[PDB]
Amino acid sequence: EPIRIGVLLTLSGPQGVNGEGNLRGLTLALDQAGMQFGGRPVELIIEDSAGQPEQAITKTRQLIERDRVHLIAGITLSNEAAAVRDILVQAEMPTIVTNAGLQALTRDPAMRSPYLFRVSFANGQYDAPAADYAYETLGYRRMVLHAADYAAGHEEMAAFRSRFEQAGGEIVDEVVAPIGTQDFGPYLQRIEQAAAEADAVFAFHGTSTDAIRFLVQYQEFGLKDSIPLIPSGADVDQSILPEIGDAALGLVSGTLYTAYNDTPESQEFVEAFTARHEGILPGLVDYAGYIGGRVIAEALTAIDGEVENKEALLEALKAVEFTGPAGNFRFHPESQGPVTTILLCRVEQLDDGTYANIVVDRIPDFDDLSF
């Protein structure tokens, strides 16, 4: 009778804030759907991976072997994804990835699988349209790239470069800074110098204290006044927008979602989210969890809960389509990553003092293969 769904997330340690966001979005979607399908109650079995590959393995083995779940959602870190991929595939377990943006998982034909779906992004996917915007609308021809020095950072630089290069632009330098950098001074100076022969900078750190320290120092050091900057959408996420504030004002970025999107489905998700979370606005990770849950809900509805029929479950997941809070969402038929609407936004200040990502332009049907 019950429909058992495993959720593997990083819910403690410094990455726990991301898993928590995913879990809020996911449960909100399953609750709007009533937590039952075809007369069958859902039960979520939640396991914390603590951001650790070996614990991700243990947890994943347990949900499959002990808990006998019919589906797994989540996976916070790319290193956790890489460590459990083979287990999920060998077990023929339908899996909905809500965060881990590891490019290979959908883009490399050897890592992909019909059991793996991704509803968040491949790294770089929501930033790459900002490179089109930089070339086509802003007139930039030569850019400097900067990122925190880890895998997602490299992949975001590469995705940005690829689109900027395809439009006819050129990348003059890449500047990388270690994770947990306190003084961005030296990296800022290097960026300044590269930008003598450049029109603008793109920077990614993820939604992190790195991002806060970088943006704030970018302005304080004087570069905001002189060198246009396109932050990653992660770097101006809602959760940290109040602490940047003034440093990101007027900056344009690509993003997956903002609570200020002026569509009815976005307004409905903000209302249901804020009613549940004491006025707090949903951000990126909440959004991505929500799409996870809606996908599951739409697939389960279509097969009337007959979740043990894996063939029908997979065919139903492949066919899922709806208007979500960012726009229309579906899966690429070959990568099973997202084909979705990317929002180009600018940070603005509202009349009450609040900082907001405001939508200036939309790129529909942007897939994870086009960069």
Question: Does the annotation flag 277 for ligand binding?
Answer: yes
- H/E run at residue 59: helix 53-65
**For Cl ion, the closer CB: 232 or 341:** 341
Using CB under 5 A as the binding rule, whether residue 274 contacts Cl ion is answered as no
Which one of Zn ion, Cl ion, none is in contact with 361 (Cβ closer than 5 to 8 A by kind)? Zn ion
| Pairing label, strands 40-48, 36-37 | antiparallel
Asked if 323 touches Cl ion (CB under 5 A), the answer is no
Interacting residues with Zn ion (CB under 5 A): 43, 86, 149, 167, 183, 185, 192, 265, 268, 277, 328, 334, 361, 364-365, 367, 370
Strands 200-204 and 252-255, how do they pair?
unpaired
- Would the annotation count 351 as a binding residue? no
Of 3 and 285, which CB lies nearer to Cl ion in the complex structure? 285
Q: Encoding tokens for residue 3?
A: 């429909």
Bridge partners, 363 (sequence order): 342
**Binding flag, residue 68, Cl ion (CB under 5 A):** no
Distance CA 310, CA 251 (A): 46
Give which of Cl ion, Zn ion, none residue 43 binds (C-beta under 5 to 8 Å, depending on kind).
Zn ion
Q: Determine whether the annotation assigns residue 265 to a binding site.
A: yes
Q: Which position among 197, 277, 319, 334 is part of the footprint of Cl ion (CB under 5 A)? A: 277
Q: Report CA-CA distances (Å) from 13 to 23, 33, 52, 111, 159.
A: 16, 31, 10, 28, 29
By beta-carbon proximity to Zn ion, the closer residue of 279 and 351 is 279
Q: Does 370 bind Cl ion (CB under 5 A)?
A: yes
Q: What residue number has its CB nearest to Zn ion?
A: 185
Q: x/- binding map, residues 151-180, to Cl ion, per CB under 5 A?
A: ----------------xx------------
- Asked if 36 interacts with Cl ion (CB under 5 A), we say no
Question: Tokens 């050897």 sit at which residue?
Answer: 110
Distances (CA, A) of 78 to 20, 36, 73, 112, 266: 17, 31, 14, 14, 28
Integer angstrom CA distances of residue 212 from 97, 183, 335, 359? 27, 12, 33, 21
Say whether residue 364 binds Cl ion (CB under 5 A).
Answer: yes
Select 124 or 305, whichever has its Cβ closest to Cl ion: 124
Interface with Cl ion, residue 369, by CB under 5 A: yes
210 is annotated as contributing to ligand binding: no
- Which listed residue (107, 328, 356, 358) binds Cl ion by CB under 5 A? 328
- Taking each helix axis as running N to C, give the angle between helix 264-276 and helix 16-32, from 0 to 180 degrees, rounded to the nearest 10: 110
**Whole-angstrom distance, CA of residue 339 vs CA of residue 130:** 17
Size, binding site for Cl ion by CB under 5 A = 9
Laid out side by side, the sheet with 3-9 consists of 36-37, 40-48, 3-9, 71-74, 95-97, 116-118
Half-sphere exposure of 122 (CA within 13 A, CB side): 29
Distance CA 6, CA 63 (A): 6
Nearest distance in Å: CB 107, Cl ion: 10
Question: Cβ closer to Cl ion: 62 or 328?
Answer: 328
Q: Which CB atom, from 165 or from 315, has the smaller least distance to Zn ion?
A: 165
H or E segment at 201?
strand 200-204
Does 31 belong to an annotated binding site? no
Beta carbon nearer to Cl ion, 267 or 328: 328
Q: Which residues contribute to the site for Cl ion (CB under 5 A)? A: 167-168, 277, 280, 328, 330, 364, 369-370
**Residues tagged in the binding site annotation for Zn(2+):** 43, 47, 86, 136, 149, 154, 183, 192, 265, 268, 277, 334, 361, 365, 367
**Residues tagged in the binding site annotation:** 43, 47, 86, 136, 149, 154, 183, 192, 265, 268, 277, 334, 361, 365, 367
